Design a protein around this nucleic acid. Structure first.
Length: 247
DNA sequence: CTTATAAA
DNA sequence: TTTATAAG
């Protein structure tokens, strides 16, 4: 089984990821920025009870930690509840970086007709695999209370932060550089957390996929076994249907 | 909820 | 000028 053969590589069996080779990220501020503390709009009990289990899981996982910070941004009061942080005022104060993630159209142009056997993997909770340096953690604080009050913040690259997709894409590229060198006859397309591996034959695709899963797992990333498309001549990738070299 | 942009 | 849409 693809599952049993690579327990470490799958989110379902390997536990929450952590990119062990990647240094905790420091997030540079713009030259003139100072902290902004935005009050939390009062949240209804219904919303709070909805969000609570997610917050607790993240705390248990060490992805959230208590803190006291001069920064504060709101969680959405209406957000099937899940916590969404409005990081816009933080984003405005963070120094911009060059956008290096290719658009899907251009990314797909690197797929040759010679390689028509596909594996598509998506990494689960990808941003959370990247640690934030403790110096940058306070930037992302928000308020949490459970009547029956303090701030929490993220110890990993957060959702809603303007640079997360680019920083993740760049980190995974660094981590997969050797894989590319070891497998010169495979095509690997990276779009943040969405990966396409393409091979000349079913066999090469099988061996390539084994090697990619082993590598991802070893590095601390986790792919979704449920959504995995393995060694197919027809796959869905980035909203396209990849079929016989078309699209 | 707030806010940026677009469409009406 | 208002309304709608989208997104953190």
């Amino acid at each position: 089984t693809w599952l049993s053969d690579f327990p470490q590589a799958w989110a379902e069996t390997g536990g929450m990821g952590l990119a062990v080779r990647q240094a905790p990220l420091i997030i540079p501020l713009k030259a003139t920025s100072t902290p902004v503390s935005i009050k939390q709009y009062p949240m209804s009990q219904e919303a709070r009870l909805g969000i609570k289990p997610h917050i607790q899981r993240l705390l248990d996982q060490g992805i959230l930690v208590p803190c006291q910070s001069p920064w504060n941004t709101p969680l959405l009061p209406v957000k099937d509840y899940r916590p969404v942080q409005d990081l816009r005022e933080v984003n405005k104060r963070v120094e911009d970086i060059h956008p290096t993630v290719p658009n899907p159209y251009n990314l797909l142009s690197g797929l040759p007709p010679s390689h028509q056997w596909y594996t598509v993997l998506d990494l689960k909770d990808a941003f959370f695999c990247l640690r934030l340096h403790p110096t940058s953690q306070p930037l992302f604080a928000f308020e949490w209370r459970d009547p029956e009050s303090g701030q929490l913040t993220w110890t990993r690259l957060p959702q809603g932060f303007k640079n997360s997709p680019t920083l993740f894409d760049e980190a995974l590229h660094r981590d997969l550089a050797d894989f590319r060198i070891q497998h010169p006859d495979l095509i690997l397309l990276q779009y943040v957390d969405d990966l396409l591996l393409a091979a000349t034959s079913e066999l090469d695709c099988q061996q390539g996929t084994r090697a990619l899963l082993q590598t991802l797992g070893n590095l601390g990333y986790r792919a979704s076994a449920k959504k995995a498309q393995i060694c197919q001549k027809q796959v869905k990738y980035l909203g396209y249907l990849l079929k016989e070299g078309q699209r």
